[PDB]
Amino acid sequence: SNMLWALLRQYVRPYRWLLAVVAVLQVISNMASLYLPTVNAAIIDDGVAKGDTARIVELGAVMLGVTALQVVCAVGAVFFGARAATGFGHDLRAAVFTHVTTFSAEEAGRFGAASLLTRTTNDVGHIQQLVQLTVTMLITAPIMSIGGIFMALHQDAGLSWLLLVSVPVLGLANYWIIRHLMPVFTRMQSLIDGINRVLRDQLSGIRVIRAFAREPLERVRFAEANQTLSDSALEAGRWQALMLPVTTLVINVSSVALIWFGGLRIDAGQMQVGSLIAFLAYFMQILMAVLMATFMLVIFPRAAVCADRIGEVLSTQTAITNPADPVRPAAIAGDIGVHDATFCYPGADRPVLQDVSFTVPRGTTTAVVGSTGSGKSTLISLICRLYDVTSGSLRIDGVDVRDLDIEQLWSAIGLVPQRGYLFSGTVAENLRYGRADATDDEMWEALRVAAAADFVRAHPQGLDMPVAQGGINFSGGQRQRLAIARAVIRRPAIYLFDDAFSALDVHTDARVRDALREVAADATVVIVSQRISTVIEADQVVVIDDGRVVGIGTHDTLLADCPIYAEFAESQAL
Amino acid sequence: RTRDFKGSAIRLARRLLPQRALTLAVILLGVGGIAIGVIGPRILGHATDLLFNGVIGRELPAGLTKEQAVEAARARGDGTFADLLSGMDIVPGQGVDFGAVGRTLALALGLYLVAALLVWVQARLLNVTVQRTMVALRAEVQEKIHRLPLSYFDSRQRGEVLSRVTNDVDNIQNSVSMTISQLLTSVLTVFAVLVMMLTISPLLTLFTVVTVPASLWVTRWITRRSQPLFVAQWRNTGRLAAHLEETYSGFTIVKTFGHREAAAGKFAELNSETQQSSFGAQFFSGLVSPATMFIGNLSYVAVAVVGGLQVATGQITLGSIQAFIQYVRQFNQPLTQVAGMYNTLQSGIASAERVFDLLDTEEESADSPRRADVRTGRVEFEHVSFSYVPGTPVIEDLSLVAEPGSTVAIVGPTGAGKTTLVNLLMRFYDVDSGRITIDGVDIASVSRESLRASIGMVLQDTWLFAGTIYDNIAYGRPDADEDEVIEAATAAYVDRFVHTLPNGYDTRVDDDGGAISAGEKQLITIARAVLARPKLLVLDEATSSVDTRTELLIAHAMAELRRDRTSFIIAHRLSTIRDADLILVMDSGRIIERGTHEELLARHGRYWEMTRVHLGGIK
Ligand SMILES: Nc1ncnc2c1ncn2[C@@H]1O[C@H](COP(=O)(O)OP(=O)(O)O)[C@@H](O)[C@H]1O
Numbered sequence A: 001s002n003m004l005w006a007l008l009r010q011y012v013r014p015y016r017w018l019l020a021v022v023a024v025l026q027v028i029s030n031m032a033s034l035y036l037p038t039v040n041a042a043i044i045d046d047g048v049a050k051g052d053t054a055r056i057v058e059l060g061a062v063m064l065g066v067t068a069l070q071v072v073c074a075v076g077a078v079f080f081g082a083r084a085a086t087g088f089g090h091d092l093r094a095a096v097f098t099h100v101t102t103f104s105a106e107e108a109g110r111f112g113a114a115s116l117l118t119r120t121t122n123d124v125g126h127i128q129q130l131v132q133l134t135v136t137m138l139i140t141a142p143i144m145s146i147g148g149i150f151m152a153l154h155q156d157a158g159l160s161w162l163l164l165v166s167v168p169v170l171g172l173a174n175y176w177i178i179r180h181l182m183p184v185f186t187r188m189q190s191l192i193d194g195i196n197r198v199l200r201d202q203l204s205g206i207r208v209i210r211a212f213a214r215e216p217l218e219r220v221r222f223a224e225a226n227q228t229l230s231d232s233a234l235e236a237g238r239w240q241a242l243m244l245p246v247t248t249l250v251i252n253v254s255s256v257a258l259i260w261f262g263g264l265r266i267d268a269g270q271m272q273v274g275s276l277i278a279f280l281a282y283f284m285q286i287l288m289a290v291l292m293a294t295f296m297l298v299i300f301p302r303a304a305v306c307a308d309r310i311g312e313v314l315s316t317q318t319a320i321t322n323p324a325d326p327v328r329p330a331a332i333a334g335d336i337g338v339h340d341a342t343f344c345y346p347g348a349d350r351p352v353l354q355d356v357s358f359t360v361p362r363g364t365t366t367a368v369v370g371s372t373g374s375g376k377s378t379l380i381s382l383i384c385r386l387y388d389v390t391s392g393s394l395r396i397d398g399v400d401v402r403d404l405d406i407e408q409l410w411s412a413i414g415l416v417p418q419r420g421y422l423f424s425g426t427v428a429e430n431l432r433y434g435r436a437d438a439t440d441d442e443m444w445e446a447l448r449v450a451a452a453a454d455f456v457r458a459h460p461q462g463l464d465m466p467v468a469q470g471g472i473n474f475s476g477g478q479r480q481r482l483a484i485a486r487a488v489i490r491r492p493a494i495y496l497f498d499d500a501f502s503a504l505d506v507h508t509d510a511r512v513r514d515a516l517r518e519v520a521a522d523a524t525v526v527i528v529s530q531r532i533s534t535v536i537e538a539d540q541v542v543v544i545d546d547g548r549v550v551g552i553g554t555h556d557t558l559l560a561d562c563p564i565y566a567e568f569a570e571s572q573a574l
Numbered sequence B: 001r002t003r004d005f006k007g008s009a010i011r012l013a014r015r016l017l018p019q020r021a022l023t024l025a026v027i028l029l030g031v032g033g034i035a036i037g038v039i040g041p042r043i044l045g046h047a048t049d050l051l052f053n054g055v056i057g058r059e060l061p062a063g064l065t066k067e068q069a070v071e072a073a074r075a076r077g078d079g080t081f082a083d084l085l086s087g088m089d090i091v092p093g094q095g096v097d098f099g100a101v102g103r104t105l106a107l108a109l110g111l112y113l114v115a116a117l118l119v120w121v122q123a124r125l126l127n128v129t130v131q132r133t134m135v136a137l138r139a140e141v142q143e144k145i146h147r148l149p150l151s152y153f154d155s156r157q158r159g160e161v162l163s164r165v166t167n168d169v170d171n172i173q174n175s176v177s178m179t180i181s182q183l184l185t186s187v188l189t190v191f192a193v194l195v196m197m198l199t200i201s202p203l204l205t206l207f208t209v210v211t212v213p214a215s216l217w218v219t220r221w222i223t224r225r226s227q228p229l230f231v232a233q234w235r236n237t238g239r240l241a242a243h244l245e246e247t248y249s250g251f252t253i254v255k256t257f258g259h260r261e262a263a264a265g266k267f268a269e270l271n272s273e274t275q276q277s278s279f280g281a282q283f284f285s286g287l288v289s290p291a292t293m294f295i296g297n298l299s300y301v302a303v304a305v306v307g308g309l310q311v312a313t314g315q316i317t318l319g320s321i322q323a324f325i326q327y328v329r330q331f332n333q334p335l336t337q338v339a340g341m342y343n344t345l346q347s348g349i350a351s352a353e354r355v356f357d358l359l360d361t362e363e364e365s366a367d368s369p370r371r372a373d374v375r376t377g378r379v380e381f382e383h384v385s386f387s388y389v390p391g392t393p394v395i396e397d398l399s400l401v402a403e404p405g406s407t408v409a410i411v412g413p414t415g416a417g418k419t420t421l422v423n424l425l426m427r428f429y430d431v432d433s434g435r436i437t438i439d440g441v442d443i444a445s446v447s448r449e450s451l452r453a454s455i456g457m458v459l460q461d462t463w464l465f466a467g468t469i470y471d472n473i474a475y476g477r478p479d480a481d482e483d484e485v486i487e488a489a490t491a492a493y494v495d496r497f498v499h500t501l502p503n504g505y506d507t508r509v510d511d512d513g514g515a516i517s518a519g520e521k522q523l524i525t526i527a528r529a530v531l532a533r534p535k536l537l538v539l540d541e542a543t544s545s546v547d548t549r550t551e552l553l554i555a556h557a558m559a560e561l562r563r564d565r566t567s568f569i570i571a572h573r574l575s576t577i578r579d580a581d582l583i584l585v586m587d588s589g590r591i592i593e594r595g596t597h598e599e600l601l602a603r604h605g606r607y608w609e610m611t612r613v614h615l616g617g618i619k
């Protein structure tokens, strides 16, 4: 787990003189909890051995002052620990999110939207809770051990050899167990996660699991995960059963030898009985600090794969960024010039696209069409640079697209992707994304153009109705037309619809297309669909099949030219 | 909100009943290993008192006995010292007598060695009785999941049934391994360490007993003062994830329409306010100990001072105060972790009645064993009147009939009762006063396994468990070689895109690069159905995302060419259902009209005007 330390020393950088005030108060709060037996030794020494009954009551004030200082600097350590440990984690997710927002579609789709959320909002939580637990509660074991050794050297150092021998073993027999437990403890976390995945996949598809009557295979593939988790956990609880008894046997045997080797000293008269009281409390407090610290060594295996996943996110170098000398054209009006464009996955047998080449004029309408998985899905994303062409060149009227600044590229492209995602909030702000300074009637113009006024004007507050987080309240074409209107109010130079009109029926599709034609008289439009009736009026149509383009032309010139388009149009008529 | 505590606790304990022997072997073995770790300090104190009695007695005049020595000490003015000498057992003129010290320490070491082999065995047995009773729970949960009706599953919210079998049994693990290991002994280290604390000096033991209320009050005041903050940070880390989710899922629409700055600023102005809201929730929850340890030393100082004053007065012995100090330290610990003992047990028992509510529900219809066989297919319905909740009828009377080898099809608007007609066909739900006879024999009295394994069904929404694409496609027939799997998957046209993937047939479609769209994800399900070789094939809006030509090729290669079998083809695109053997138009049940394409179109019914919306473009 070398990534946990690299990811841990990088981000709590500014909180050095905020953990050096925790590590200096955990020393005062442990030199004042180990000093109480030291002064009880004076009670037994200067107050009990002699008569001197005034000494005990006079020095009890010293014991009260010490225990007040021990808490005035123990509540001042948890205050500075769980403030540096909250600055960290905050600074960790503020850097995970900032790096993720630089991903392209290709990389952001490799992690997902939930595995990239649990890796930035809950994943950082484990490393953030680890720091607030090994700065106030786990460093108290080495501090208490070193402080006990030093206090035993301050007090009758002749017998301090017992604490100098009782401690290397207390931390070595407890290091051997941790060394033999950590692999088994981190092999249990990835196995209790593989049973939760089985349960999730059995509850998500309970209908189709029973549809095949495939219930003998289930609860037997689950029985090979339950009985294996119960083995990899019973083996980790086999080494965890030696962490209490060994550390208590070491302390108790050291305590028993303490009385013998202290009596051998008091016999000579070079040692007093109160020193036994002090040493026995030193040993007991060291045991208490070691037990409470090594009881929660479960955080490290659980927060060591969390750091691995967060470092996996943070180490993904982006491949789509602004170039060194991006050209700034005065206008980037729509003129798409795809030549030789190819897209291929790393290690794939056949490329997604292979030698596609078409050029659209200034303000006409093109339409690609093909079977499912025949490359046309990525053609829209290549125009707006959601991916990178491997061995091709596509340009808009003056320059290669990757030799062009991506932000200005997006600023004049109205994109409607396959799924219409509607952000949480209100229609007055959800579709405000198109222009961000549109007037009141300008936001109704798009809803009229997109044939979307009939559900937005029929509301008490007009264009202010509430929306769900993902717009799930709007079932289908409602969401689709909301996204369409979002696209319409941009005055885009390039309309880019990817499987947009599939959700609508034919009449609303025709209405939207006529409205766009009457509105977008000069802006080029690229429509991707699996329907023919919405492609008939396109100024040019291209068919792509298993990648490669097979025909370029209009509807009439192509319906009787190539078999694939003809058969595509056959299953459209009634 | 844990509406039952006594009953839930008794049921959770009764879950441990089968390991009665191995639970008594834990309770009794932890009693003997905690009543041996308390008597040990008494032996140690006896040793240190045998030391003291000689150390402060060997310089007294020899020949002088105890009483006359005390009288001489009191006569020379030292009254406190005389009381001290009268307060223990000394003999002037004699030394340390290391034989007694050695014999005492040899017993102390003996029962301390026993006390570490008697706790290791207890921990081993306890882990055995935990990981063997929790296999039973995690297997009963699985056996109950595959027995509940679907009506249980669809009537809950999104993740309510998921966070009841995964995150709701781990809490049972924690709150059953902490109340038998960390809580059972934390009560013995308050009962025994006090019954032995009592025999030393009753005055001293009330200087620590009055710090149990003083510690519980402060650990409860801190807990009930850290409420407004611990629920103002859960509420804030929820608003954090409610924005991160919507800025990650719609990431292509945040990049495009370049509001990356706006989405970063919104995250910045609500991350800086979850930091500042978790700061207090952690500070107040971490100051719970630096405060129950202040009154764990307010008692220790009093104990030490009064013990010194009492040894100096001769009312008690030094070897008893030495053991009493360790008793105070042991009694002080069973309190620094009482907040984490109660808020973990309460949480783990509140999330322990959900499991029992799940396990306490009703099973399925207890199928009758018949093993019905489909010869040709006569799926004929007779007056099916299904309803979800009594009062809202969704499927009214309908008596659709089919042909042994035709492909009867269903069309209709959204919400017209098609998917839940397939659900009736698959016996997912219960029919209401309506016969559903498939091939003459009614399936209302038929083993569900034999029925559902003979139908073959694909749906609008696809399921792909964690595994390779080959594994998902072969899940329809697990005993099929790659020779039969690839041959039956190429008929569904999966190759045309899986070969384009980085590693075809081994893409592991649970965590991918997102290279599979909705239609490609539906072709996989179609192939998986092809593997099973169904005899009564039902495609319920299967081809809603895949191209309309690929649908035609598939439905002509494995739905129309299959003369031997019959199929329902429920779809919204009329171009794939025209000329397809008795289309049925439905409108919230109540089959409007039926027949082949020509008779249905030549009558100007709902079918004709629906085709006008799908071909004429008028609506
Ligand atoms: N298990 C269920 N519990 C409650 N309501 C349901 C259930 N199944 C379906 N419904 C509702 O009943 C309505 C019936 O429509 P439905 O039969 O699903 O048509 P379709 O299958 O074409 O969507 C749906 O709108 C749905 O919201």
Ligand SMILES: [Mg+2]
Pocket: B415, B418, B419, B420, B541
């Ligand atoms: Mg349906």
